[PDB]
Write a protein that binds this ligand. Structure first.
Ligand SMILES: CN(C)CC[C@H](c1ccccc1)n1cc(NC(=O)c2n[nH]c3cc(-c4cn[nH]c4)ccc23)cn1
Length: 233
């Protein structure tokens, strides 16, 4: 990236030797603008390298809009379908590990995602995966039966996300109606093991898919568990 000199303002000399200067930079930076005061300011304090940053809110004129971070390669769902077969098992695990880092920060700050999926996960420079936007195929039994949301209901969605990643962007419960999904999941049916997913990785998905929400592990526990798989093989 080349920067035009006129965009920069030099204010003070900070460190001598080249010469380091405190300066200001006015630039037209690429952003993602979501179109429609208090709930918008609590989202701004939430900063993490694995979460899509909210830069600000435009309120002076209608429609009001939120200014988010721009991710160079768009949503993960399409990214996996487009570049199918090009990914290694480690790269796919590393994608789940990036999402888990962000979700561990969100659960620590007591924030429920309510729609965690590959479509809401974005790919940036050097294949960084970040979580954004904070569907019975991603919904846990307590969400489609009692509408009870928690970090444990997000853990079920993370299990479906992991599956989506290892199946390389495949649609979960394909050629199955919403009602058919609900009855089968409740019976004990789960998404099959994707070829690229290890036997142990599939067990973690099934741990995320435990009918009892408290039986499911936390994102803090999933982060340790997944990183351990990345170190061993
Ligand atoms: C490379 N392909 C995947 C297609 C390129 C696609 C695009 C670009 C221009 C016109 C049409 C399609 N593309 C999209 C992005 N970026 C984003 O989609 C994006 N980048 N940052 C985002 C933040 C949110 C967001 C929603 N709620 N909170 C944040 C939602 C979406 C985004 C990068 N390339």
């Amino acid at each position: 990236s080349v920067i035009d000199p006129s965009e920069l303002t030099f204010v003070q000399e900070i460190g001598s030797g080249g010469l380091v200067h405190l300066g200001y930079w006015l630039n037209k930076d690429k952003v993602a603008i979501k179109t429609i005061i208090e709930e918008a300011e609590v989202m701004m304090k939430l900063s993490h390298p694995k979460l899509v940053q909210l830069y600000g809110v435009c309120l002076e004129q209608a429609p009001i809009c939120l200014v988010f971070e721009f991710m160079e390669h768009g949503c993960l769902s399409d990214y996996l379908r487009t570049q199918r077969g090009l990914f290694a098992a480690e790269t796919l695990l590393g994608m789940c590990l990036d999402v888990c880092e962000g979700m561990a920060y969100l659960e620590e700050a007591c924030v429920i995602h309510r729609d965690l999926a590959a479509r809401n996960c974005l790919v940036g420079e050097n294949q960084v995966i970040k979580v954004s936007d904070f569907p019975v195929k991603w919904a846990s039994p307590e969400v489609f039966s009692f509408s009870r949301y928690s970090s444990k209901s997000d853990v079920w969605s993370f299990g479906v996300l992991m599956w989506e990643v290892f199946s390389e962007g495949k649609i979960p419960y394909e050629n199955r109606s919403n009602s058919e999904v609900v009855e089968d999941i409740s019976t004990g049916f789960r998404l099959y093991k994707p070829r690229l997913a290890s036997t142990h990785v599939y067990q973690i998905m099934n741990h995320c898919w435990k009918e009892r929400p408290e039986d499911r592990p936390a994102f803090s526990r999933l982060l340790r568990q997944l990183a351990e798989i990345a170190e061993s093989g």
